[PDB]
Amino acid sequence: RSQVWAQKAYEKVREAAKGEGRGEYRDMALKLPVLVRQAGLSQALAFVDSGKEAHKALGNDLAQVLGYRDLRELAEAAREAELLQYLRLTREVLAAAEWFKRFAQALI
Amino acid sequence: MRTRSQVWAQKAYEKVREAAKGEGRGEYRDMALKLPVLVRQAGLSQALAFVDSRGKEAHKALGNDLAQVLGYRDLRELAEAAREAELLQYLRLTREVLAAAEWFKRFAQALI
Amino acid sequence: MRTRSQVWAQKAYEKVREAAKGEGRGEYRDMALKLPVLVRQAGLSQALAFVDSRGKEAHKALGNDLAQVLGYRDLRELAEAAREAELLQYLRLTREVLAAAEWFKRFAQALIE
């Protein structure tokens, strides 16, 4: 799984590194992990869900990697989840976000 | 039994011992195993509300037993203490409940 | 020139040396030692509200001193700034207050018995 996440994140980041909004994508990629850790999953996703296209691009890519159709669907899932599933989703988002962060710092 | 934590451990030990005998010992254990992370990651109030809203009697018994180990009549009473507490008292109850929950988890693992 | 955190460290140092001369320095130290913990476990907003609702002058003084070290008028201005801050600014403010608080704690441990 981590490898599937590693691969998918790498794929998304490579594709993002060819766009004019790479620096902004990178900024969001490196910031999301700490946001999820300190503000909690739902607050972090709401922050991403709210200006520049590049920032939300990270959220959507990450959501897709997790098998969700878009950032909103992941946000919807986190809010609908019962407590145990919420913590599981947080752990999952955190792990996948670290990959986006690492490949973003290496490829951008 | 000198230690305060040790006192909670021995009382928790007795509760788990009882629970291991009846039916639903598996569900009790399942809850005993998750309560610590619930308290750590979600906070005391949410953790207790989760346990108190579970359908299974075995899941709620864990909470009831932990409350009694800490000096409360039951989970409802413990949850009320948490909602009435001022900040320092709430953080203290949080540490208290977490410590007791860890003992329940450990003994459930060894006895059920 | 001194780094940002170095400035806070030294201003905190001055605030503590001054509290060491007044009455209630023991209560001042108690609050200084407890604040970092509250910010980490309860969050910035909650930690600040706890300090502001204290009835003992020495406890509240720690709060106003820290806010001044950070460049605010007093605890009330810092608290409002925390409530109005959007997420990133709130997390950044949290880091700053926690860093300043740790210095108050450290100097209280060294200067107030």
Which three-class secondary structure string do you get for A33-97?
Answer: HHHHHHHCHHHHHHHHHCCCHHHHHHHHHHHHHCCCCCHHHHHHHHHHCCHHHHHHHHHHHHHHH
> CB contacts < 8 Å between B and C, how many?
8
d(CA A40, CA B108): 30
How many angstroms separate the Cα of A67 from the Cα of each of A70, A74, A93, A96, A108? 9, 9, 11, 12, 25
d(CA B16, CA B8): 12
Q: Which of C29, C92, C26, C91 lies closest to C65, judged by CA?
A: C29
CB atoms near residue C58 (< 10 Å)? 19
Contact partners for chain A, using 3 or more CB pairs closer than 8 A, are B, C
Chain A CA closest to residue B40: A87
**A87 reaches C (C-beta below 8 A):** no
Close Cβ partners of C8 (under 8 Å, ≥ 6 residues apart)? C69, C70, C96, C99, C100, C103
In the block, tokens 């981590």 appear at A2
Q: What share of chain A is helix, strand, coil (3-state, %, to 5)?
A: 85, 0, 15
Residues on chain C touching A35 (C-beta within 8 angstroms): 87, 91
Please name the method used to determine this structure: X-ray
Q: What are the residue ranges of helices labelled H in chain C? A: 4-19, 25-42, 44-52, 57-69, 75-84, 87-111
In the block, tokens 């639903």 appear at B24
- Put simply, the chain B residues between 38 and 57 with a CB less than 8 A from any chain A CB are 38, 41-42, 46-47, 50
Chain A CA closest to residue C94: A38
**A87 reaches B (C-beta below 8 A):** yes
Contact partners for chain C, using 3 or more CB pairs closer than 8 A, are A, B
d(CA C76, CA C67): 8
**CB within 8 Å: B91 and C42:** yes
**CB within 8 Å: A47 and C88:** yes
Which class is domain A1-108?
Answer: mainly alpha
Chain A CA closest to residue C87: A47
CB atoms near residue A1 (< 10 Å)? 8
How many angstroms separate the Cα of B92 from the Cα of each of A19, B86, B88, B99, C64? 51, 10, 6, 11, 26
**Which fold, C2-113?**
Peroxidase; domain 1 (1.10.520)
Please name the CATH architecture into which domain B2-112 falls.
Orthogonal Bundle (1.10)
Contact A13, A100 (CB under 8 A): yes
Q: What's the angle, vertex CA C50, arms to CA C47 and CA C51, rounded to 5?
A: 90
Contact B22, B37 (CB under 8 A): no
> What amino acid is encoded at A4 in this protein?
V
Chain A CA closest to residue B50: A83
Contact C83, C52 (CB under 8 A): no
Nearest-CA distance from A76 to chain C in Å?
20
Q: Which of A49, A50, A52, A45 lies closest to A22, judged by CA?
A: A52
Contact B1, B7 (CB under 8 A): yes
d(CA B75, CA B52): 7
**B91 reaches C (C-beta below 8 A):** yes
Nearest-CA distance from C22 to chain B in Å?
26
**A84 reaches B (C-beta below 8 A):** yes
Domain boundaries, chain C: 2-113
In the block, tokens 């860093």 appear at C99
Residues on chain A touching C91 (C-beta within 8 angstroms): 34-35, 38-39
Chain A CA closest to residue B35: A84
Structure tokens at B102: 């860890």
Structure tokens at C60: 């509240």
**B1 reaches C (C-beta below 8 A):** no
